[PDB]
Structure formats: structure tokens, C-alpha cells
Design an enzyme around this catalytic site. Structure first.
Site, PDB file in Angstrom:
ATOM      1  N   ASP A 160      -0.268  -7.653   1.187  1.00 33.43           N
ATOM      2  CA  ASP A 160       0.164  -6.259   1.347  1.00 33.43           C
ATOM      3  C   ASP A 160       1.687  -6.141   1.489  1.00 33.43           C
ATOM      4  O   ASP A 160       2.186  -5.353   2.294  1.00 33.43           O
ATOM      5  CB  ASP A 160      -0.558  -5.579   2.508  1.00 33.43           C
ATOM      6  CG  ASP A 160      -0.477  -4.059   2.445  1.00 33.43           C
ATOM      7  OD1 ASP A 160       0.007  -3.520   1.441  1.00 33.43           O
ATOM      8  OD2 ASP A 160      -0.906  -3.404   3.427  1.00 33.43           O
ATOM      9  N   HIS A 185       0.805  -1.214   0.000  1.00 35.66           N
ATOM     10  CA  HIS A 185       0.000   0.000   0.000  1.00 35.66           C
ATOM     11  C   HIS A 185       0.846   1.276   0.000  1.00 35.66           C
ATOM     12  O   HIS A 185       0.341   2.342  -0.362  1.00 35.66           O
ATOM     13  CB  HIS A 185      -1.061  -0.009   1.113  1.00 35.66           C
ATOM     14  CG  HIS A 185      -0.518   0.181   2.494  1.00 35.66           C
ATOM     15  ND1 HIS A 185      -0.394  -0.852   3.398  1.00 35.66           N
ATOM     16  CD2 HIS A 185      -0.096   1.296   3.135  1.00 35.66           C
ATOM     17  CE1 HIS A 185       0.117  -0.384   4.527  1.00 35.66           C
ATOM     18  NE2 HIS A 185       0.287   0.921   4.400  1.00 35.66           N
ATOM     19  N   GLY A 243       3.976   6.654   9.326  1.00 37.10           N
ATOM     20  CA  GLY A 243       5.335   6.559   8.793  1.00 37.10           C
ATOM     21  C   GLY A 243       6.062   5.307   9.218  1.00 37.10           C
ATOM     22  O   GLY A 243       7.174   5.046   8.749  1.00 37.10           O
TER      23      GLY A 243
END
Ligand SMILES: *[C@](O)(C(=O)NC1CC1)[C@H](CCC)NC(=O)[C@@H]1[C@H]2CCC[C@H]2CN1C(=O)[C@@H](NC(=O)[C@@H](NC(=O)c1cnccn1)C1CCCCC1)C(C)(C)C
Ligand SMILES: [Zn+2]
Length: 201
Positions: free
Chosen positions: A102, A78, A158
């Protein structure tokens, strides 16, 4: 139709720093600033020395983490999509791409160090964040853990692509998402290292 000559290419993922875990103290180091990062994303040519297990990586819009385990630098789909990563010889194609997990991976850059997958089965985990906080997490399932101290979700922004480690410093998972309630992260979702190991054979 469309004008083919003006079709742009997506930039490479660029290593812009690392989370230093080598000593007694965890801390973030920046190795490339914004202008350098932008240029390097376009050329895919990154002559910087790489060190360590956890890299700070950037696309054009986002900055997050990537973690070396068993000679592959892993991160989240992603975040990275299908992007190449910048390297001394130019852009490097992904070695693994799995949207369903993912997960993406590239060959680990020369100079990087890899984590070893955990074999101890401990449910007492530690999440390494993009600001080099080491946060205790109790494992609650194959892909979930609870924060011992809940935090605003901003604290975890982050950190996608970073590691969850066991008490011996082995890789247990790759952080993928926060489970949040009214902006507070109480739990985390991760890709278990066994899933990476199956991907690698
Ligand atoms: C990570 O990619 C990162 O560091 N990004 C910054 C820009 C560079 C980031 C880290 C989050 C702290 N991860 C995400 O943003 C992931 C990815 C996974 C695929 C879509 C996005 C969404 N995401 C999340 O962590 C979200 N969390 C959720 O969607 C959870 N749902 C809820 O918290 C929720 C709250 N209220 C009502 C309903 N749901 C789900 C829960 C089930 C497991 C998967 C995550 C946010 C909301 C962004 C934290
Ligand atoms: Zn372990």
C-alpha cells in the site's frame, strides 16, 4: 471500442500545504487553494516552493499526507494510485509503486527535508495528523499501535500517508488505516519504515 480522442488523463497529485514541525509548535500551512490545486493537477506544473518533511497533498477527490524519508516522498497507494506528482518541470513519475505494501513514492521535491529512519526500537510513538495534532501511540506490533486516547475516526481522516515518529523524531512508519469500533479509532495500522528501507535497498 471507444472514442480515443476524448479519453481523459488522471491528474497529478498536488502539494497544497505542509505540516510545519520546524519550531516548538506543530501547525498546518496551506500553500495552494482549490482553484490552483485543480489547475496544477491538470498541467502537472507546480512552481511553488516546497519546504518541510510532511506535505499535504491532494487528488481531485481527496486530501491526505505524504512524508519525506531518505530523499523519497512517500504516501499510500490507496490514496495516490499510480499518479504522477506535480513539479516545477511538469509531472514526475513514481519511483516506487507497491500495491501489496500500500505504498508509493516519488523523488523528494527540491526544498523538502527528509526524516531519517528510526533505529532506537522505541515502542512509544507519535502520529502526526493532517491537522497537525501530535497523537501518542503505543506500538503493539510490527504494523499496529494503540491510541492512548481513542478518537472518532473523523479525527484521522486525511492523515493517511503521514508519519509515526519515535521520541527522537525519527520515522517509524507511514499511517495507512484506523482500526475502528462503532466509529471510534482505538488503534492504527501503518507501514513500517523497515519496509520502505527494503523497497529503497
Ligand atoms: C486515509 O486514506 C485518509 O486519510 N483518507 C482520507 C480521504 C483522504 C484513511 C485514514 C482512515 C482514518 N485510510 C483508510 O481509509 C484505510 C484504507 C486502507 C485500504 C482501505 C481503506 C480503509 N481504511 C481504513 O482505515 C478503514 N479501516 C478498516 O477497514 C479497518 N477495519 C475496521 O475498522 C473494522 C471495523 N468494524 C468491523 C470490521 N472492521 C481495518 C482493520 C485491519 C487493518 C486494516 C484496517 C476505515 C473503516 C475507513 C477506518
Ligand atoms: Zn527512534
Amino acid at each position: 471500442g471507444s472514442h480515443m480522442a476524448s479519453m481523459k488523463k488522471k491528474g497529478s497529485v498536488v502539494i497544497v500545504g505542509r505540516i510545519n514541525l520546524s519550531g516548538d509548535t506543530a501547525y498546518a500551512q496551506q500553500t495552494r487553494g482549490e482553484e490552483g490545486c485543480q489547475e496544477t493537477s491538470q498541467t502537472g506544473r507546480d512552481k511553488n516552493q516546497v519546504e518541510g518533511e510532511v506535505q499535504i497533498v491532494s487528488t481531485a477527490t481527496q486530501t491526505f499526507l505524504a512524508t519525506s524519508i531518505n530523499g523519497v516522498l512517500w504516501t499510500v497507494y490507496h490514496g495516490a494510485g499510480t499518479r504522477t506528482i506535480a513539479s516545477p518541470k511538469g509531472p514526475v513519475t513514481q519511483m516506487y509503486t507497491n500495491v501489496d505494501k500500500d505504498l508509493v513514492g516519488w523523488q523528494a521535491p527540491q526544498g523538502s527535508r527528509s526524516l531519517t529512519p528510526c533505529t532506537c526500537g522505541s515502542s512509544d510513538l507519535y502520529l502526526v495528523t493532517r491537522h497537525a495534532d501530535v497523537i501518542p501511540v503505543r506500538r503493539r506490533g510490527d504494523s499496529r499501535g494503540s491510541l492512548l486516547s481513542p478518537r472518532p475516526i473523523s479525527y484521522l481522516k486525511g492523515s493517511s500517508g503521514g508519519p509515526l515518529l519515535c521520541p527522537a523524531g525519527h520515522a517509524v512508519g507511514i499511517f495507512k488505516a484506523a482500526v475502528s469500533t462503532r466509529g471510534v479509532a482505538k488503534a492504527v495500522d501503518f507501514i513500517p519504515v523497515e519496509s520502505l528501507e527494503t523497497t529503497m535497498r
